[model samples]
Target: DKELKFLVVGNGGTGKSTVRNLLKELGFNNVEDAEDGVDALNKLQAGGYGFVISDWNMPNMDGLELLKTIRADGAMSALPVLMVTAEAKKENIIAAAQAGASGYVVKPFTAATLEEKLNKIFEKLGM
Candidate 1:
């Protein structure tokens, strides 16, 4: 993929789609929202690269499960993933990192905050 593509996955009301739209407003195109974790993974297998912004709650495979699953995949193992969710407990944060999440953002966040997170990831990855 020549451009950045994002997969936004979250629970029913954690603003996953909103975050995707916000990133689009920030000039980050190819932002797509997945209703569940499996769908996100399928998208990854099909043609997903660049970055991932997923939440920690879902019916099928929660954020952590999807993160770990993707990381275990050969081709998608190193993809940058950012977990955006309302589950801000200490253990959840630890789990996200251990599961291969590149970053985390809490709920009720703004585009600027998301942008800040992405910028930090970019800096860390030397993008």
Candidate 2:
């Protein structure tokens, strides 16, 4: 994954913890976890991560807002964010894409799902 790192934001279950373990197994070791969107924004502003994986629902702020904030921030604009959540509505997908999300994945996913999505995003970047 180059020297790039990731920020993972989510609530209980939803396999958020499993994603971390899978990432490490796949050799992407530099990740930081956030309990919600606000923490994610704080960490993102503090700098370091090049990628993000967030749930659609959370307290304080949600993944959509986080995605918009990242897109709006001149410094963080173009940062890749993947929304991995149970929100399967067509509108949610469209909105995330419009907000500049790099990718999207529905939950109850396997590590293979994570791998596939991550590879796809990096491939698009020519990374």
TM-score of each: 0.88, 0.91
- How well is each residue in 1-127 modelled by candidate 2, as lDDT tens digits? 4457978898634455577777887888888899998888887778878888888989999889888988889998878888887758999899988788888888777777788889998899777
**Clash count for each candidate, listed in order shown:** 0, 0
TM-score between model 2 and native: 0.91
Clashing pairs in 1: none
Determine which window of 10 residues in candidate 1 has minimal summed lDDT.
11-20
Candidate 1 stretches with Cα past 4 Å from truth are 11-17
